[PDB]
């Protein structure tokens, strides 16, 4: 007998391919496979994952032929056995939700007294549509300092405050996942 | 089922030029990203590059930065390492390999997960 | 690079059936972005475990990986006469130096 599987994650980087990962089982009884069928609501025919490998172990991804038609999908995970064999749960997934980028890009930090921080989208991200809007944060916080300071920019790619430190930046596509922290630069 | 085959490998002069090749199949070029790894004959595992071929862009391993270019052809699916100003301890056997995902977009990849089997460059008079 | 891999002992043997460990630690948080490769001689490395701890497919089940604060820890359950190699870490956090290796681990079979 399995063995119930669960489909427990989903990225895209920008909207263009996404992929998700599940995880087993439990095979013994006989090894198992391992298959993952979607559709899109309210169509009755159940297609199977069209690029098994390139997700990783346990992925499923999907193309930028996949993408650029269907929105929205319904999945399933069969781990079918032997003596036993069994489905997982069916999840939905919409790309706009499963989107998280690369962090903002060369965050440059002046002194102008009073302090200026500027940055760029990140790369991976059109905008152009700009099929995005796009809502960034800031931290700062003295090199040996105890707490961080935080400001959320909402939009645009620069900012201004009133203050030996550290600076990074990060954003998200609402409604999706916060990049990782873009690498910290230091300002006397 | 997956393949990754190099070639360009070769013997080249102190300050000559070489350009490698990885010919991949049977996972999504566009969404992954080319590595080159080198080994220099009896010692470990020297990061040489990668490129995430959709985007374009690229890092580089200090001992290479200025020397060395990564690129990739998408239509025909190979990445490329451009050696210039090769010196001798540029001798070593060089892997190409694949992560899922680009260039600062990392976290995702199962490791390296595909690799070549490696050709052979030797910088020698 | 500016994270540093290290990995030890640099060899060592074991009888078939001892359980082995090799330890990288990196030189500061990578959170839990490392691998482990395994490379048989003449050969071209296989992974063997990515994401700090997970088995990767077809890797038989005695090899797991495992991670505090910093420390990273392949470890062979119960050594097999196959298992002779040279062992590597791996990094994947640093945004502009992802990648980079340990020095490897050589581990051969006591007999």
């Known amino acids: 007998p399995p063995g119930k599987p669960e489909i427990f994650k989903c990225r895209s980087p920008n909207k263009e391919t996404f992929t998700c990962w599940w995880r087993p089982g439990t095979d013994g009884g006989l090894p198992t496979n391992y298959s993952l069928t979607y559709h899109r609501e309210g169509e009755t025919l159940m297609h199977e994952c069209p690029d098994y490998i390139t997700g990783g172990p346990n992925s499923c991804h999907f193309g930028k032929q996949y993408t650029s038609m269907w929105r929205t999908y319904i999945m399933m995970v069969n781990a079918t056995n032997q003596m036993g064999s069994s489905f997982s749960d069916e999840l939905y997934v919409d790309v706009t939700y499963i989107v998280q980028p690369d962090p903002p890009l060369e965050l440059a930090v002046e002194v102008k007294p009073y302090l200026w921080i500027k940055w760029s989208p990140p790369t991976l991200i059109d905008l152009k549509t700009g099929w995005f809007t796009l809502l960034y944060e800031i931290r700062l916080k003295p090199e040996k300092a105890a707490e961080w300071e935080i400001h959320f920019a909402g939009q645009q790619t620069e900012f201004k405050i009133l203050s030996k430190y550290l600076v990074q930046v990060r954003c998200k596509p609402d409604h999706g996942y916060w990049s990782a922290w873009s690498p910290a630069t230091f300002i006397q | 089922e997956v393949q990754l085959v190099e070639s360009g490998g070769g013997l080249v002069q102190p300050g000559g030029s070489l350009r490698l090749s990885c010919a991949a199949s049977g996972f999504n070029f566009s969404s992954s990203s080319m590595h080159w790894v080198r080994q220099a004959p009896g010692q470990g595992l020297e990061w040489v590059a990668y490129?995430?071929?959709?985007?374009?862009?690229?890092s580089y391993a200090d001992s290479v930065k200025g020397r060395f270019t990564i690129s990739a052809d998408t239509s025909k699916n190979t990445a490329y390492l451009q050696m210039n100003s090769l010196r001798a301890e540029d001798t070593a056997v060089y892997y190409c390999?694949?992560?899922?995902?680009?260039?600062?977009?990392?976290?995702?990849?199962?490791?390296?997960?595909?690799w070549g089997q490696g050709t052979l460059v030797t910088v020698s008079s | 690079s500016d994270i540093q891999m290290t990995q030890s002992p640099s060899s060592l043997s074991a009888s078939v059936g001892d359980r082995v460990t090799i330890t990288c630690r990196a030189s500061q948080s990578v959170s839990s972005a490392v691998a482990w490769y395994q490379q048989k001689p003449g050969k071209a490395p296989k992974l063997l475990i990515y994401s700090a701890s997970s088995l990767y497919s077809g890797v038989p089940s005695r090899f797991s990986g495992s991670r505090s604060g910093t420390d990273f820890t392949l470890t062979i359950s119960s050594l097999q006469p196959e298992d002779f190699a040279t062992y590597y870490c791996?990094?994947?956090?640093?945004?502009?130096?992802?990648?980079?290796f340990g020095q490897g681990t050589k581990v051969e079979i006591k007999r």
């Open positions: 791996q990094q994947y956090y640093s945004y502009y130096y992802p990648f980079t």
């Open positions: 390999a694949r992560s899922y995902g680009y260039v600062y977009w990392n976290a995702y990849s199962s490791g390296m997960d595909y």
């Open positions: 490129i995430s071929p959709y985007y374009g862009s690229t």
